[PDB]
Amino acid sequence: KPHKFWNTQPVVQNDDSSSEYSFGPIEIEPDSFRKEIYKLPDGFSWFDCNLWDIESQDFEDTYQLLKDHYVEDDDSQFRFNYSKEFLRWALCVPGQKKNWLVGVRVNETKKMVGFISAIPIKVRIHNCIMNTSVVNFLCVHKKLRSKRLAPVLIKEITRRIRCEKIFQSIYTCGKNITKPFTIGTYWHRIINVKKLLEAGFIGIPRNMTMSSLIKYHRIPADKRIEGFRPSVDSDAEQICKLFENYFMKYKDVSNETMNNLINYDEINHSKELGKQAYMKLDKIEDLQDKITIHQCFNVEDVKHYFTNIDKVIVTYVRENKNKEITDLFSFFIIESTVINNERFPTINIAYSYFNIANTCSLKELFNEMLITAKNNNCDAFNTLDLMQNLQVIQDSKFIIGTGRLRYYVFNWKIPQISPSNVGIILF
């Protein structure tokens, strides 16, 4: 069946017949976009969600909405239970705008029935760099589904983002909407066998028991790598350089292009000037084993994202004798509710974030990270096949998950690429 909203938006459609590998914006309309607030059905209202005071009623309403109505696995066995501390870390980022956190409320009862958010980030896409957005936590109350409310919330957040002179966005989905520029596969490393076995996540193969299963999913500790410790704020500048060196090494453009990236923020104000971001690629094979699109981090961003908050985010670095940082691993933590058992204990899952292995192999780095995940009472460690993570997944004890993660970019052209070419991690 055909789209009724997405067929009208500047994104590559599923039937695109482009005969060329091209990068660049799809449309350049700095002045023609709608600026008036969108209208909601009678008895509903917009509000800027107050996630700036963790004790606010807005925060309680948002937490409850997402706990009961946000993302479930494709088999409706588990639902995400984002904590307030996680949402604050994930949405109150540097440069965030108070009106990029959009809620929908029933006027008569003050019940919050909808939500959508965006955060600002910096990205490199091939030979361009820009300030862009990431849309996440789109949620509509279950009883209001299939009433064309989601396009309204999308149009609304788009208006608010464009009013900040930002005209692209990145967003992920478990299903196919339009054409995604890549599809990521996630994998599970079992840590707490007993918990996951009783939660219904894993079974028992023939001729095995929980004991032999615990023994098999054991995390090895016979070749530890010394020098890893939690990051602190004073590591920020060196973690910033560690990422820059990492993205410089895996770049998919020449050294000359990397030093003269096209700053789209300076040419998106004009239709003629913005076309300088058009870039044709003659050989898609030139991107093999390289990163084509990735987030960029300054020191203020590093301080926020690559910190340590109990039950939210974990970041470790490896040092040498001189206190210089040479490796980094990180994962964030989200609780998952068991849908058919409201009394089941807490299930905490770890999610691979950004990881840089220079003084050890990536498999060696992930083992240290798995040990640290065990120390943080995480029942499983989830990883996507992004960047170089395939090195850890192949010939391992990782188990394939049931779904796949589609990656989209709003108002930008990206040819279909491998997930290994992508350095973008959504929350």
Ligand SMILES: CCCCCCCCCCCCCC(=O)SCCNC(=O)CCNC(=O)[C@H](O)C(C)(C)COP(=O)(O)OP(=O)(O)OC[C@H]1O[C@@H](n2cnc3c(N)ncnc32)[C@H](O)[C@@H]1OP(=O)(O)O
């Ligand atoms: C420059 C700035 C631009 C900023 C904007 C950038 C783009 C951001 C876009 C948002 C990305 C968010 C990123 C995340 O957080 S991804 C996860 C989103 N949240 C959930 O999955 C939680 C559980 N489910 C729900 O909350 C609702 O089912 C939602 C709200 C998802 C849809 O509500 P409902 O189920 O009641 O449907 P409808 O009748 O209102 O409307 C039908 C239309 O909605 C399109 N649809 C359905 N699901 C998604 C989806 N996950 N991404 C994009 N579009 C989606 C669908 O194609 C159809 O369009 P078309 O097929 O007719 O065309």
Ligand SMILES: Cc1nc(NC(=O)c2cccc3c2C(=O)N(c2ccc4ccccc4c2N2CCCNCC2)C3)sc1C
């Ligand atoms: C061990 C265990 N894993 C479960 N996963 C689910 O239920 C589930 C259901 C639907 C969709 C998803 C999941 C799930 O894990 N995804 C997943 C998997 C690996 C990631 C690696 C890095 C970053 C994110 C990752 C990520 N996200 C989830 C957070 C939100 N950002 C989108 C992508 C998507 S339940 C359970 C008991």
Ligand SMILES: [Cl-]
């Ligand atoms: Cl619609």
Ligand SMILES: [Cl-]
């Ligand atoms: Cl797809």
Ligand SMILES: [Cl-]
């Ligand atoms: Cl040590």
Ligand SMILES: [Cl-]
């Ligand atoms: Cl600190």
